[PDB]
């Protein structure tokens, strides 16, 4: 009741009333009211990172958030928070950064109290026990154990490592069961007392901020949050910070050489800079990021493309902890790009000096500020979970008025700070890091935490005083005036024939359309998507392999053009699919024709630059064979899909048939793919119907004019089918993951086709076991960190599956899955009526749920139009059937389909095992699959779903 805000800045598009305030204990509290919300939510953000761990025990903050979910004193039950949040269509999640820790959930329509009080008790008083600390370090072990081979983490921790080892930046965030449990009891240090001291010392102070997205009012719930978080008492803890940047000059001007596990090649150029979060109005780091990492005519990337060294580069500044900041230029390399690294970084300082001779620019600032203002003014709607965590995550830095207008509105252009940050980029401030797999036997030093190998080649002063000596220019230039900036912001009015669902308007043997004027959102922007078909796209590996090469070289030769469209707010995307290729252009309403047209005319009338083809061929050949270095459960989900379809070729087939694709072969292939084809598309958003027909008209007329496209026969508009397992079966086949020391498994129960009365059986049964599966297979039995069980839907045919990876041998896992099945049905027949209607209500709220963003319903319409079902109302009638279901019905679904004695039992299993590898029921004999194609030769195939 200390501070109340009067009115804050909101976009005139929003409707959500806001209020900011501050409590007696100094918590910055933000209140959001919404009359038309449907899932309320809340979050909190304690400003304590993993950079405040004690030196003996490493990774307490992460172990603490990981242990806080389990157990309080006002709710001694182990799962009452998770169980109550999952009975009400909600989900809770949390994480720790290096500087702070976010806690956030969401909940159903009005159940704020019964879940907010559970989230509040979270911090008033937690109670731990032997059990939790005893079976949680196994989950933190799986956490580290999935990232010891994870290539996004080894460089992160190796940059954390080779710095100032007396500095708090050189700290470990995770803990690997050895420093957490085994080291402190190696020397008798207790852990529970350390956890209660950590929590009572750090977390309880002013530091944390809260936010709640309420339904009721902006005065009904302000008096709610003043009586519910008032207990946490300010201990006057100042924010931990440290003015000394971790890079001291002894370890500057140095060039490491790191050896990866998966085959990649990269060059990181690291500069240290002081803190510029205090300067959040001029934002000099975004200026130099806009001027360095910019594709287009005559810029840093396009020249490195032109010399054949570099595929892409990312500029901008990395932000680390508080009181210090970084600045990174990270590049990847071609085969002979790794020979000329000194010349690459020489060109980088060439472009820097070309930007230092001319310095600041007024019109670039005005352009960027106009772009952020227009991008703020039509800011789309937010999903209420994740949004409140974001605006609680930046609430520590900014005052109450501009909590929303953060990095969107800019007041002044001050060239002095541009010049300041542009002076700190000097080759006395460099730290080069090279990643290449060619250094296998050359590395002396190794990492202790993760076990990676690297070097010290400190750069002698030859090449430093070759870098800053004489830097005039290459063929660089500044970017030119933008023409994709939008000018039309007019909402077109609703016409006479206004429909709630997209209607078929054109139906010819060449194309079809699906059109709907936007009725809800009124944003001057629309999304257009297309799916071109060809029977030649997946005939054999060679023709399934040329498709990715052609499409990729199209994206290569057109990014140079269309980066200004992706920068102004018009994004396109063109990738291949199994049946044919695909296209999706979304964004502001004004410049779709220009962009789409240019995409088509670059698509049909397409030449090949030979060196570009020869680069992309190798960059894909090195992207097939490094599929073997990847997670076990992803290999399970890869193998299961290949076996359960009519035709598909492995990653071992396609990389053998890349020894044949050549330029003349590919060059006659493009007229073969675009010779006869068929188009299917939806148009969505704010467009009139005559302009919709004009869009498809220009599209198919350009393909007529340049490609001589003819329509396909309707008997070769076909899909693929799914293998039908025998009425009683136990299919399993094992493969061996080569580089991960874990095992993994996926088991598949296939029921039937897409019906309106049989999707709700499997959906409800996958909702009744969603929490107990997590609760008894990850928490209680501690089988690993990756546990998931839900509906899998391919080709219409629905099946319930289980993805799980662990240290244990996999048939042990499949047996204890069966134990979970038995315990589940025993818990189903015992459960009461009221909880059963609660589960039905949780599914009727989760599924009967309106999409907020316009792309969230265009991806709801398109995802079924590409499945040829065309059923737009399956969210209403299906859930109207869900309300009339009985308790015995689920047992009738269960007994003959999922049970062990069932007559109708379809089950196939994929075992991925490792490099060197409570009552269980009785399993029948398996039959092993030693060959996929001889397997798929003797089984029938399901029929396809008839359209609506």
């Amino acid at each position: 009741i200390k501070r109340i805000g009067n009115h804050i800045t909101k976009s005139p598009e929003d409707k959500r009333e806001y209020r900011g305030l501050e409590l007696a204990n100094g918590i910055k509290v933000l209140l959001i009211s919404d009359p038309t919300t449907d899932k309320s939510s809340a979050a909190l953000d304690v400003h304590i990172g993993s950079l405040s761990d004690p030196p003996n025990i490493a990774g307490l903050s992460h172990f603490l958030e990981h242990m806080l979910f389990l157990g309080t004193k006002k709710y001694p039950k182990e799962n009452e928070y998770s169980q109550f949040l999952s009975e009400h269509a909600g989900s809770s999640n949390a994480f720790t950064s290096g500087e702070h820790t976010n806690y956030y959930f969401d909940v159903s329509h009005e159940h704020l109290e019964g879940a907010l009080d559970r989230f509040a008790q979270f911090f008033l008083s937690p109670l731990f026990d032997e059990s939790a600390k005893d079976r949680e370090v196994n989950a933190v072990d799986s956490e580290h154990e999935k990232n010891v081979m994870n290539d996004a983490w080894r460089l992160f921790q190796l940059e954390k490592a080779t710095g100032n080892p007396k500095h708090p930046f050189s700290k470990f965030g995770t803990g690997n069961k050895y420093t957490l449990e085994t080291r402190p009891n190696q020397e008798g240090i207790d852990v529970r007392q350390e956890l209660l001291k950590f929590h009572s010392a750090y977390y309880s102070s002013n530091l944390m901020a809260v936010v709640v997205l309420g339904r009721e009012s902006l005065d009904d719930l302000t008096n709610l949050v003043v009586k519910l978080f008032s207990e946490v008492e300010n201990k006057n803890v100042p924010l931990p910070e440290f003015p000394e940047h971790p890079f001291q000059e002894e370890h500057l001007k140095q060039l490491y050489k790191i050896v990866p596990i998966k085959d990649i090649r990269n060059l990181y150029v690291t500069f240290p800079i002081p803190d510029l979060q205090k300067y959040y109005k001029s934002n000099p780091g975004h200026y130099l990021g806009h001027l360095i990492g910019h594709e287009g005519p005559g810029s840093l990337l396009s020249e490195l493309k032109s010399k054949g060294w570099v595929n892409t580069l990312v500029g901008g500044q990395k932000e680390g902890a508080r009181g210090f900041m970084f600045f990174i230029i990270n590049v990847d390399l071609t085969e002979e790009g790794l020979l000329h690294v000194e010349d690459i970084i020489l060109h980088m300082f060439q472009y820097i000096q070309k930007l230092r001779a001319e310095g600041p620019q007024e019109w670039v600032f005005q352009e960027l500020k106009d772009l952020n203002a227009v991008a703020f003014r039509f800011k789309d709607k937010e999903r209420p979970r994740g949004y409140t965590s974001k605006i609680a995550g930046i609430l520590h830095y900014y005052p109450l008025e501009e909590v929303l207008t953060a990095e969107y509105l800019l007041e002044e252009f001050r060239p002095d700070l541009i010049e300041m940050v542009l002076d700190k980029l000097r080759p006395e401030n460099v730290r080069v890091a090279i990643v290449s797999k060619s250094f296998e036997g050359k590395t002396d030093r190794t990492e202790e935490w993760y076990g990676t190998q690297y070097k010290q080649e400190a750069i002698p002063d030859e090449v430093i005083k070759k870098w800053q000596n004489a830097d005039l220019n290459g063929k660089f230039k500044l970017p030119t005036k933008n023409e994709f900036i939008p000018t039309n912001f007019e909402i077109l009015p609703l016409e006479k024939e206004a429909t709630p669902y997209p209607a078929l308007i054109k139906d010819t043997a060449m194309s079809k359309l699906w059109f709907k004027q936007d009725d809800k959102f009124f944003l001057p922007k629309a999304n257009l998507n297309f799916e071109f078909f060809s029977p030649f796209a997946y005939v054999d590996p060679l023709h399934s392999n040329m498709a990715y090469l052609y499409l990729e070289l199209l994206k290569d030769s057109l990014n140079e053009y269309a980066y200004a469209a992706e920068l102004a707010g018009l994004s396109y995307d063109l990738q291949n699919t199994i049946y044919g290729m695909y296209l999706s252009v979304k964004g502001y309403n004004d410049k779709q024709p220009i962009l789409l047209k240019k995409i088509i005319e670059k698509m049909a009338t397409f030449e090949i630059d030979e060196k570009r083809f020869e680069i992309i061929k190798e960059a894909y050949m090195r992207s097939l064979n490094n599929f073997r270095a990847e997670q076990p459960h992803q290999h399970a989900m890869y193998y299961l899909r290949l076996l359960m379809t009519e035709v598909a070729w492995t990653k071992d087939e396609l990389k053998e048939a890349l020894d044949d694709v050549t330029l003349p072969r590919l060059k006659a292939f493009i007229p073969q793919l675009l010779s006869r084809l068929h188009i299917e598309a939806l148009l969505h958003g704010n467009i009139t119907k005559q302009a919709a027909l004009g869009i498809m008209q220009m599209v198919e007329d350009t393909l007529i004019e340049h490609a001589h496209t003819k329509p396909l026969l309707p008997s070769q508009l076909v899909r693929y089918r799914e293998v039908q397992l025998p009425d009683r079966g136990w299919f399993v086949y094992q493969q061996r993951n080569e580089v991960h020391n874990n095992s993994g498994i996926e088991i598949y129960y296939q029921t039937d086709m897409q019906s309106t009365s049989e999707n709700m059986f499997l959906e409800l049964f996958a909702q009744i076991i969603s929490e107990p599966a997590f609760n008894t297979l990850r928490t209680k039995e501690q089988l690993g960190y990756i546990v998931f069980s839900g509906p899998r839907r391919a080709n219409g045919i629905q099946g319930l599956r289980f993805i799980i990876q662990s240290e244990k041998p996999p048939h042990y896992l499949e047996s204890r899955v069966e134990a979970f099945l038995i315990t589940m049905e025993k818990s189903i027949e015992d459960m009461t009526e009221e909880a059963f209607q609660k589960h039905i209500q949780a599914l009727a709220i989760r599924r009967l749920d309106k999409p907020k963003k316009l792309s969230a319903e265009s991806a709801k319409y398109w995802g079924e139009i590409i499945s040829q079902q065309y059923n737009f109302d399956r969210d209403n009638t299906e859930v109207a059937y869900l309300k009339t279901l009985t308790k015995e019905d689920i047992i009738k679904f269960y007994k003959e389909m999922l049970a062990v004695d069932a007559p109708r039992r379809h089950k196939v299993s994929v075992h991925v095992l490792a490099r060197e590898m409570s009552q269980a029921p009785a399993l029948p004999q398996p039959e092993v699959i030693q060959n996929m194609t001889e397997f798929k030769r003797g089984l029938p195939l399901f029929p396809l779903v008839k359209p609506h």
Binding site: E295, T312, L313, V314, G315, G316, Q317, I328
Partner: peptide, 5 residues
């Protein structure tokens, strides 16, 4: 390609 984006 700015790092933030």
């Amino acid at each position: 390609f700015v790092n933030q984006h």
